Design an enzyme around this catalytic site. Structure first.
Site, mmCIF file in Angstrom:
data_model
loop_
_atom_site.group_PDB
_atom_site.id
_atom_site.type_symbol
_atom_site.label_atom_id
_atom_site.label_comp_id
_atom_site.label_asym_id
_atom_site.label_seq_id
_atom_site.Cartn_x
_atom_site.Cartn_y
_atom_site.Cartn_z
ATOM 1 N N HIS A 115 4.644 0.011 -4.747
ATOM 2 C CA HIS A 115 3.261 -0.451 -4.812
ATOM 3 C C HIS A 115 2.287 0.553 -4.206
ATOM 4 O O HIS A 115 1.095 0.513 -4.531
ATOM 5 C CB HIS A 115 3.131 -1.820 -4.122
ATOM 6 C CG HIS A 115 2.954 -1.752 -2.634
ATOM 7 N ND1 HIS A 115 4.013 -1.837 -1.755
ATOM 8 C CD2 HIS A 115 1.840 -1.645 -1.869
ATOM 9 C CE1 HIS A 115 3.562 -1.761 -0.515
ATOM 10 N NE2 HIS A 115 2.246 -1.642 -0.557
ATOM 11 N N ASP A 164 10.571 -3.089 -4.745
ATOM 12 C CA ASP A 164 9.434 -2.294 -4.273
ATOM 13 C C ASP A 164 9.974 -1.036 -3.597
ATOM 14 O O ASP A 164 10.089 -0.942 -2.373
ATOM 15 C CB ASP A 164 8.562 -3.110 -3.325
ATOM 16 C CG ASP A 164 7.276 -2.391 -2.934
ATOM 17 O OD1 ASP A 164 6.996 -1.308 -3.489
ATOM 18 O OD2 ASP A 164 6.542 -2.913 -2.068
ATOM 19 N N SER A 265 2.369 0.798 4.473
ATOM 20 C CA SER A 265 3.157 0.682 3.250
ATOM 21 C C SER A 265 3.974 1.941 2.995
ATOM 22 O O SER A 265 3.455 3.060 3.065
ATOM 23 C CB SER A 265 2.235 0.415 2.058
ATOM 24 O OG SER A 265 1.636 -0.865 2.140
HETATM 25 N N1 LIG Z 1 3.268 -10.163 8.621
HETATM 26 C C1 LIG Z 1 2.979 -8.991 7.810
HETATM 27 N N2 LIG Z 1 1.959 -8.876 6.802
HETATM 28 C C2 LIG Z 1 2.008 -7.526 6.225
HETATM 29 C C3 LIG Z 1 1.224 -6.917 5.211
HETATM 30 C C4 LIG Z 1 1.464 -5.553 4.811
HETATM 31 C C5 LIG Z 1 0.551 -4.955 3.697
HETATM 32 C C6 LIG Z 1 1.158 -3.895 2.660
HETATM 33 N N3 LIG Z 1 1.460 -4.513 1.340
HETATM 34 C C7 LIG Z 1 0.356 -4.878 0.503
HETATM 35 O O1 LIG Z 1 -0.780 -4.712 0.801
HETATM 36 C C8 LIG Z 1 0.692 -5.559 -0.847
HETATM 37 C C9 LIG Z 1 -0.119 -5.146 -2.082
HETATM 38 C C10 LIG Z 1 -0.756 -6.564 -2.125
HETATM 39 N N4 LIG Z 1 0.073 -6.954 -0.934
HETATM 40 C C11 LIG Z 1 0.308 -8.071 -0.077
HETATM 41 O O2 LIG Z 1 1.084 -7.981 0.835
HETATM 42 C C12 LIG Z 1 -0.417 -9.470 -0.278
HETATM 43 C C13 LIG Z 1 -0.254 -10.042 -1.736
HETATM 44 C C14 LIG Z 1 0.057 -11.571 -2.027
HETATM 45 C C15 LIG Z 1 1.565 -11.786 -2.498
HETATM 46 C C16 LIG Z 1 1.838 -11.955 -3.868
HETATM 47 C C17 LIG Z 1 3.131 -12.141 -4.381
HETATM 48 C C18 LIG Z 1 4.239 -12.166 -3.533
HETATM 49 C C19 LIG Z 1 4.006 -11.994 -2.164
HETATM 50 C C20 LIG Z 1 2.697 -11.806 -1.667
HETATM 51 C C21 LIG Z 1 -0.353 -12.486 -0.851
HETATM 52 C C22 LIG Z 1 -0.545 -11.869 0.541
HETATM 53 N N5 LIG Z 1 0.191 -10.516 0.702
HETATM 54 C C23 LIG Z 1 2.487 -4.897 5.479
HETATM 55 C C24 LIG Z 1 3.290 -5.488 6.502
HETATM 56 C C25 LIG Z 1 3.031 -6.836 6.875
HETATM 57 N N6 LIG Z 1 3.651 -7.688 7.849
#
Ligand SMILES: Nc1nc2cc(CCNC(=O)[C@@H]3CCN3C(=O)[C@H]3C[C@@H](c4ccccc4)CCN3)ccc2[nH]1
Length: 318
Positions: A115, A164, A265
């Site tokens: 991603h 991923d 990420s």
């Molecule tokens: N407790 C903790 N939260 C974390 C966050 C990150 C951000 C780095 N990854 C991103 O930014 C990616 C690209 C979009 N993303 C999300 O995480 C969003 C999308 C959505 C969802 C849709 C379908 C399945 C699962 C989740 C709902 C909220 N999570 C890293 C480590 C972390 N440790």
């Protein structure tokens, strides 16, 4: 008769019988920079054979391989503290669409999350890859560029985070030293170090408790979460059902206070093989809730041991 030998990458050739002799039974010797590289395949002694091509003591007529040493660390992001030089010599900064990270493998590959590089691969724009630096924005770093980006074929962008994982081929070999060193890939028994409540380490420049990206590289030690608790933590709205798969592991605290976050990420969640005394990559920073560091809202990581056949296929074929 056999001709000048081929040069060894990260190594060299030395004529044993005499300077320039290439005839039958002539002896040459290969060698690596043994401090930061290690010779593989054979011991490097090659004798010209009647076939007319250099041959080792095992019959091979191809080069040996100078493999970089991996997993070395000067030790031995929410709620972390500042890394010192050499704690994470594999850490890579990736600049393109947004700030992201990776981990050096060998001296010409970078492991990261799919991603983090998906939009720039399919836009056919090269990734700006930096390493050898603790400061995200410093002008002094080791520069590399992507020659090719390989995204896992089961990854579906904007449709969850199963598979991923991605590999970046660098257009140049980076110099290996105490400042820059790759992470080891896990061995097949490495799961013995990645049980529930075993401790790994995430590092990155992502958001801290302050809510801003860190200027300096940070890190936290956090335990592996029971997979039931991982599944249950994210089986609720707004998440799709089945967001947590068997290709993932959770890490963090049921009380909160230690986590990865946005901007981390692609970073490697590393673990110490206490018997080899080498660090290896067990996870890749993938996703999690919006509220990093919150109690029971664990960070979700791609499970790297599941992808050793995929990684080895791509690195060996390209
Ligand atoms: N407790 C903790 N939260 C974390 C966050 C990150 C951000 C780095 N990854 C991103 O930014 C990616 C690209 C979009 N993303 C999300 O995480 C969003 C999308 C959505 C969802 C849709 C379908 C399945 C699962 C989740 C709902 C909220 N999570 C890293 C480590 C972390 N440790």
């Amino acid at each position: 008769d056999c001709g000048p030998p081929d040069d060894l990458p990260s190594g060299r050739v030395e004529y044993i019988t005499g300077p320039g002799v290439t005839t039958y039974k002539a002896v040459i010797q290969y060698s690596c920079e043994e401090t930061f590289y290690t010779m593989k395949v054979n011991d490097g002694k090659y004798v010209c054979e009647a076939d007319g091509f250099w041959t080792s003591s095992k019959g091979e007529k191809s080069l040996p391989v100078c493999e970089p040493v991996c997993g070395l660390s000067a030790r031995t992001i929410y709620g972390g503290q500042k890394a010192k030089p050499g704690d994470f010599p594999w850490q890579v900064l990736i600049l393109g669409g947004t700030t992201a990270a990776g981990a050096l493998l060998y001296d010409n590959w970078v492991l990261t999350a799919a991603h983090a590089v998906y939009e720039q691969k399919h836009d056919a724009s090269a990734l700006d890859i930096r390493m050898g630096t603790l400061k995200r924005l410093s002008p002094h770093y080791t520069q590399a560029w992507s020659e090719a980006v390989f995204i896992h074929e089961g990854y579906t962008h904007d449709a969850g985070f199963d598979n991923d994982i991605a590999l970046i081929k660098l257009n140049n070999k980076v110099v290996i030293n105490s400042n820059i060193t790759p992470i080891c890939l896990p061995r097949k028994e490495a799961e013995s170090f990645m049980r529930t409540d075993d401790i790994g380490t995430a590092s990155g420049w992502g958001l801290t408790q302050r809510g801003f990206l860190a200027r300096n590289l940070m890190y936290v030690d956090i335990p592996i979460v029971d997979h039931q608790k991982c599944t249950a933590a994210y089986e609720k709205p707004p998440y799709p059902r089945g967001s947590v798969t068997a290709n993932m592991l959770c890490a963090g605290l049921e009380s909160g206070g230690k986590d990865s976050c946005r901007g981390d990420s692609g970073g490697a969640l590393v673990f110490l093989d206490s018997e080899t005394e080498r660090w290896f990559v067990g996870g890749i920073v993938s996703w999690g809730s919006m509220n990093c560091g919150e109690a029971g809202q664990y960070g979700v990581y791609t499970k790297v041991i599941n992808y050793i056949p995929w990684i080895e296929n791509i690195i060996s074929d390209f």
